[PDB]
């Protein structure tokens, strides 16, 4: 608000995730490893309140590596045969400070035969003294 005496920092929590599992029988183009990525907020905290859209920059070896998510649970499901750093972007709803955050999530896949991959990690964005519109959405989250 515009009546600030104590500096308030509102923190939003975004979560990077991905699973990986191998099919013993690759696809036509020989892609063996199937995975799925996650960008969202913690359980009960909805990012769709302060978050607008989302984008994934997979590797160029992947058809249309940039996957955009303008909907609920933001994710990507693809198949390949290697891991890599995947620069993920979450778009924020603001006219103020950066309207995007880029999370370089490490896409690791497990060896053929026994792949258990289910990883989720949580990032923190603290906004010191944000405008009401921003504060307001961050609170609704």
């Amino acid at each position: 608000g515009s009546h600030m005496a104590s500096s308030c920092a509102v923190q939003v929590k975004l979560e990077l995730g991905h699973r990986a599992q191998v099919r013993k029988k690759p696809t036509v183009e020989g892609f063996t490893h199937d995975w799925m990525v996650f960008v969202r907020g913690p359980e009960h905290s909805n990012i769709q309140h302060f978050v607008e859209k989302v984008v994934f920059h997979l590797h160029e070896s992947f058809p249309r590596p940039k996957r955009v998510c303008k909907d609920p649970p933001y994710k990507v499901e693809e198949s390949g045969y290697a891991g890599f750093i995947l620069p993920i972007e979450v778009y924020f709803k603001n006219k103020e400070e950066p309207r995007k955050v880029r999370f370089d999530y490490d896409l690791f896949l497990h060896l053929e035969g026994h792949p258990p991959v289910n990883h989720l990690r949580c990032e923190k964005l603290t906004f010191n003294n944000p405008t009401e519109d921003f504060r307001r959405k961050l609170l609704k989250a």
Binding site: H33, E60, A82, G83, F84, L109, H110
Partner: peptide
Amino acid sequence: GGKAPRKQLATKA
């Protein structure tokens, strides 16, 4: 750590 191969055709620099 049974981590599968990784494509290093790109550059992180």
